[PDB]
């Protein structure tokens, strides 16, 4: 009754994981709740709806703009901004902020948009203000991948900020100039749930 | 072969290890009218491809079923650490002797997906003494340095992914003994491909 007993199923995309809202939410719940025992579960965004829905889950950190997110209860954490995934040798590596227009001839290492959504649309509408569409080269399964395919001189890629900590070498990170493309995440469960451990891990993720 | 197509096979964690991302960034300089085609999966997922036609070379990790109508080269043996969060009482440590991590819950990924990696961490632990406590099954190592910065445990990944930095997590490397991640090229025996034949002497040199 007060969700410090109890079982919680918390979901999350591997792209979030970075983000140090999802592991300092875990975090911060567990300390508080230590009785409490989580089954973590990672997936893509359209996974894990499909197991709320299901009632496999309980909670998840997915990416807004799924097909059927009306049916579900949304909360949008904070936004984190999109940044340049290019090689240390690249000469837009010698700019601090890199205007997209000049990577406009560059072959883009990006993600199926079911999986990046806002991720994915964040960097079309980038590209679109530098005035030209992004020429795709690979299409990666795992967001987190482009940077070791930026390290094989694949080409360049765009990634959420938190992303930075990924440190391969031949890889840097710089952000968009003139410009303030974003990535979007959002705590998702069950409408009418009133469950205590879950009631406790949403008030821990918000405030 | 300076012309036709090259379909590369690797996993998440192998993208990690120099060999790969060398070996296609000096294939891709020697033949730029090859096509490569990049592909990322697991172990299995690699091979089944490979056996049915639809990739011709993937770095993957040994111990999937079969090796049969393949011809596997070992690349790289690498060390493997301990993924430590920072408050973890045994990141004090400079160093770590597997027996100290015991009663601590491990954040793992399933056999499947590993194999060797995996049955390289049972083995370390049993050598130390004691069968590990997976406090969670994850299916990228890179999720799972993220689960150890929410303190939900501890792991045992390769070298290589030292490179993940993520805060809150240090890696310490194993005192006592030598756990091994295993790295391999995996490719169909008897394929006259000449760009799977340059692509391999990039790799073996």
Same mark, same amino acid.
């Given at each position: 009754?007060?969700?410090?007993?109890?079982?919680?199923?918390?979901?999350?995309?591997?792209? %979030?994981?970075?983000?140090? *809202?999802?592991?300092? %939410?875990?975090?911060?719940?567990?300390?508080?709740?230590?009785?409490?025992?989580?089954?973590?579960?990672?997936?893509?965004?359209?996974?894990?709806?499909?197991?709320?829905?299901?009632?496999?889950?309980? *909670?998840?950190? @997915?990416?807004?703009?799924?097909?059927?997110?009306?049916?579900?209860?949304?909360? @949008?954490?904070?936004?984190?901004? $999109?940044?340049? *995934?290019?090689?240390?040798?690249?000469?837009?590596? %010698?700019?601090?902020?890199?205007?997209?227009?000049?990577?406009?001839?560059?072959?883009?290492?990006?993600?199926?948009?079911?999986?990046?959504?806002?991720?994915?649309?964040?960097?079309?509408? %980038?590209?679109?203000?530098?005035?030209?569409?992004?020429?795709?080269?690979?299409?990666?399964?795992?967001?987190?991948?482009?940077?070791?395919?930026?390290?094989?001189?694949?080409?360049?890629?765009?990634?959420?900020?938190? $992303?930075?900590?990924?440190?391969?070498?031949?890889?840097?990170?710089?952000? *968009?100039?003139?410009?303030?493309?974003?990535?979007?995440?959002?705590?998702?469960?069950?409408?009418?749930?009133?469950?205590?451990?879950?009631?406790?891990?949403?008030?821990?993720?918000?405030?």
């Amino acid at each position: 009754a007060r969700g410090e007993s109890g079982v919680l199923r918390v979901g999350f995309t591997a792209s %979030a994981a970075f983000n140090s *809202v999802v592991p300092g %939410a875990i975090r911060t719940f567990k300390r508080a709740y230590p009785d409490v025992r989580l089954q973590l579960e990672e997936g893509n965004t359209t996974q894990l709806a499909d197991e709320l829905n299901e009632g496999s889950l309980d *909670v998840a950190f @997915l990416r807004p703009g799924f097909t059927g997110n009306e049916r579900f209860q949304l909360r @949008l954490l904070s936004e984190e901004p $999109m940044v340049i *995934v290019l090689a240390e040798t690249h000469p837009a590596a %010698a700019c601090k902020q890199i205007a997209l227009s000049i990577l406009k001839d560059e072959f883009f290492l990006l993600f199926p948009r079911e999986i990046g959504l806002s991720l994915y649309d964040a960097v079309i509408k %980038a590209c679109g203000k530098a005035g030209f569409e992004p020429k795709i080269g690979q299409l990666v399964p795992q967001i987190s991948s482009v940077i070791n395919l930026v390290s094989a001189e694949m080409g360049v890629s765009m990634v959420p900020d938190s $992303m930075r900590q990924v440190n391969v070498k031949g890889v840097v990170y710089r952000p *968009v100039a003139d410009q303030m493309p974003v990535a979007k995440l959002a705590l998702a469960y069950r409408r009418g749930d009133t469950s205590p451990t879950l009631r406790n891990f949403i008030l821990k993720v918000t405030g």
